[PDB]
């Protein structure tokens, strides 16, 4: 289906307690929560391939990759990972990432297109779960 267009937050809840587990200091959580509430999804998807850009006010990533393939991106925390996405269902995948170097807490994420037209962005550390919903433009 059409995960493909321009998405804008809405919500954005227990990114604060995600950093936390990932070690960022009290400051730079706050700073980083306001920078979750400008967050911009772009996606454009072509049968199970995607390319996928996520930016704020001053940050921008591009993302690319096809569902069962392996490729590499970073943590949230900004840590080198090999990563591979599966479907979970018709309109959910599911993200496993492996630090490329050292250890850390197991990190994952989620997207899904609901039926109510919400992307839904799951983002795991552990035991934590930070949830993002977006509208289109
Ligand atoms: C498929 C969508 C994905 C994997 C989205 C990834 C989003 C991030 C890695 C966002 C990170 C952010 C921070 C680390 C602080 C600034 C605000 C965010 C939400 C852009």
């Known amino acids: 289906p059409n995960f493909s267009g321009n998405w804008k937050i809405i919500r954005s809840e227990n990114f604060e307690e995600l950093l936390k587990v990932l070690g960022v200091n009290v400051m730079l959580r706050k700073i980083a929560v306001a920078a979750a509430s400008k967050q911009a999804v772009?996606?454009?998807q072509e049968g199970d391939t995607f390319y996928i850009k996520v930016s704020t006010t001053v940050y921008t990533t591009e993302?690319?990759?096809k569902v069962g393939?392996?490729?590499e991106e970073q943590t949230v925390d900004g840590r080198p990972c090999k990563s591979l996405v599966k479907w979970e269902?018709?309109?959910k995948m599911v993200c496993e990432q492996?630090?490329?170097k050292?250890?850390?807490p197991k990190t994952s994420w989620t997207k899904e297109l609901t039926n109510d037209?919400?992307?839904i962005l799951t983002m795991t550390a552990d035991d934590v779960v930070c949830t993002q919903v977006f509208v289109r433009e």
């Open 42 to 44: 772009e996606i454009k």
């Open 63 to 65: 993302i690319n990759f």
């Open 69 to 71: 393939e392996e490729f």
């Open 89 to 91: 269902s018709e309109n």
């Open 98 to 100: 492996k630090l490329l």
């Open 102 to 104: 050292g250890e850390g």
């Open 117 to 119: 037209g919400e992307l």
